[PDB]
Amino acid sequence: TDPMVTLSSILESIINDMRDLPNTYPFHTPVNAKVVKDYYKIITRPMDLQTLRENVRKRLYPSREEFREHLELIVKNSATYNGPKHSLTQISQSMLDLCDEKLKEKEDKLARLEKAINPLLDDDDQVAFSFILDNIVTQKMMAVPDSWPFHHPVNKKFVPDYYKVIVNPMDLETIRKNISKHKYQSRESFLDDVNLILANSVKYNGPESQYTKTAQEIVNVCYQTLTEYDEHLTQLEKDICTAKEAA
Ligand SMILES: C[C@@H]1COCCN1c1cc(C2([S@](C)(=N)=O)CC2)nc(-c2cccc3ccccc23)n1
């Protein structure tokens, strides 16, 4: 049949199993922001199991990883709003732990479905291209001195106006997640996200801020390292295009 349907049925079954864990009801449905009146002042990406299930049914998750990322938001949001050691956060973690047990149990079947949905996940040129990009991010860009502001998404709890100014945020962890999902098939698409980190620093911090000078160095070492690997990256991009057309 349709591998997206089979995949969605597996993911829904995992939701059924997490819904059955003790004390999980506060996560079954969206937070009521008219009761929890400051919730959206603190949380940027609300998530709950009902929304997760409805998204599975809308065929929004072509792989384990897109599903797990949304599930992990449930934990992160609780850690931010309720606290990292709050019983609610521990409860949300028990659901993520069960999901990970189930994904491990079914990893070979899930891998087959993911490849049938998106053959590029099995293409050795896509995999090699993504591996190189990840190494540029971890070994060069994240090694820039004082680059910590750009390693992770800004937490709105700590910087409350950040996302009112920056409506298209980007950070190196999000880029790594994109790489793991093989989002980038060329250097151009990778550089769209890298440059967004710098543009956001110019907008939020100013062009002459030390934050922006650091972001500029991150971008500069990215260009420098991509240039060093130009001939290999060009071959991979050509072969990825050929794989993409053949599908
Ligand atoms: C907004 C700022 C400039 O523009 C680039 C992004 N910047 C960030 C980013 C982060 C993150 S975080 C920890 N996940 O929010 C991602 C690591 N933290 C902080 C920050 C947090 C809490 C207190 C701070 C006090 C002084 C200076 C910065 C503070 N600023």
> How big, in percent rounded to 5, are the helix, strand and coil portions of the chain?
70, 0, 30
If residue 237 lies in a helix (H) or strand (E), which one and from where to where? Answer: helix 230-246
Q: At what angle do helices 3-19 and 87-105 cross, to 10 degrees?
A: 140
Segments making up each domain of the chain, as ranges: 3-119, 120-247
Residue 172: which region, alpha, beta or left (left: phi > 0; alpha: psi -120 to 50)?
alpha
Among 158, 175, 210, residue to substitute to test ligand 1 (most atoms within 8 Å of Cβ) = 158
Q: What is the DSSP letter of 26?
A: G
Which CATH number, 1.20.920.10, 3.40.50.2000, 3.40.50.2300, 3.90.1150.10, labels domain 120-247? 1.20.920.10
Alpha carbon distance 21, 23 (integer Å): 7
Amino acid at 86: H
Q: Tokens in use for 99?
A: 């999901």
Q: What is the DSSP letter of 29?
A: S
Tell the residue number behind the tokens 């995992």, with chain if given: 14
Written as one string, the DSSP assignment of 133-191 is HHHIIIIIITTSTT-GGGSS---TTTSTTHHHH-SS---HHHHHHHHHTT--SSHHHHH
SS3 state of residue 222 = helix
Kindly give, in sequence order, each residue whose CB lies less than 8 Å from that of residue 152, ignoring residues fewer than 6 positions away: 171, 172, 173
Residue 206: which region, alpha, beta or left (left: phi > 0; alpha: psi -120 to 50)?
left
Alpha carbon distance 145, 147 (integer Å): 5
Q: 175 and 222 in contact (C-beta within 8 Å)?
A: no
Say whether 120-247 and 3-119 share the same fold.
yes
Which CATH number, 1.20.920.10, 2.120.10.90, 3.40.50.410, 3.40.430.10, labels domain 3-119? 1.20.920.10
Nearest CA among 216, 204, 213 for reference residue 159: 204
Alpha carbon distance 86, 243 (integer Å): 48
Q: Tokens in use for 226?
A: 């991509």
How was this model experimentally determined? Answer: X-ray
Is 233 exposed, middle or buried, given 0-12, 13-18 or 19+ CB atoms closer than 10 A? buried
Q: Tokens in use for 221?
A: 């070492």
Among 43, 159, 176, 209, residue to substitute to test ligand 1 (most atoms within 8 Å of Cβ) = 159
Alpha carbon distance 131, 182 (integer Å): 9
Cα–Cα–Cα angle for 237, 153, 62, nearest 5°? 50
Measured in angstroms, how far is the CA atom of residue 164 from the centroid of ligand 1? 15
Ligand 1 pocket, residue 204 CB under 6 Å: yes
Own/partner contacts of 3-9, CB < 8 Å, gap of 24 or more, are 3/113, 3/116, 3/117, 4/59, 4/62, 4/117, 6/113, 7/61, 7/62, 7/63, 7/110, 7/113, 7/114, 7/117, 8/56, 8/57, 8/59, 8/61
Ligand 1 pocket, residue 178 CB under 6 Å: no
SS3 state of residue 34 = coil
Q: Quick one: resolution in A?
A: 1.7
